[PDB]
Amino acid sequence: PDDFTGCVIAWNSNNLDSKGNYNYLYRPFERDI
Amino acid sequence: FKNLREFVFKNIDGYFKIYSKHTPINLVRDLPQGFSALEPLVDLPIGINITRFQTLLALHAAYYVGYLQPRTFLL
Numbered sequence: 001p002d003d004f005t006g007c008v009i010a011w012n013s014n015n016l017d018s019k020g021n022y023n024y025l026y027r028p029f030e031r032d033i
Numbered sequence: 034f035k036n037l038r039e040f041v042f043k044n045i046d047g048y049f050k051i052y053s054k055h056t057p058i059n060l061v062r063d064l065p066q067g068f069s070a071l072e073p074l075v076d077l078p079i080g081i082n083i084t085r086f087q088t089l090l091a092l093h094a095a096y097y098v099g100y101l102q103p104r105t106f107l108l
Contacts, residue, residue: 028047029047029080030047030080
């Protein structure tokens, strides 16, 4: 949301998740399952 | 009927907000006239889109459905 209150934290996973690794998919707080 | 159960269900920014109030009644024909504000009871962080709903009855009680509007009140 545009009035989001909080913190966004992110980090690189090139040496963790990458292999390739095809288990990661893409299509306010909505889970479009 | 003996028990009046009132609920408000609204879905804002992924949160399903539930307000409710239970009061004693002595009336069969229709809803009693009167005023009482409903207190917040549950707030569910679900992230689920709701467009339609259905009630669940026990098969061996009248119920009413209205809709909310963005109106201004002086409380």
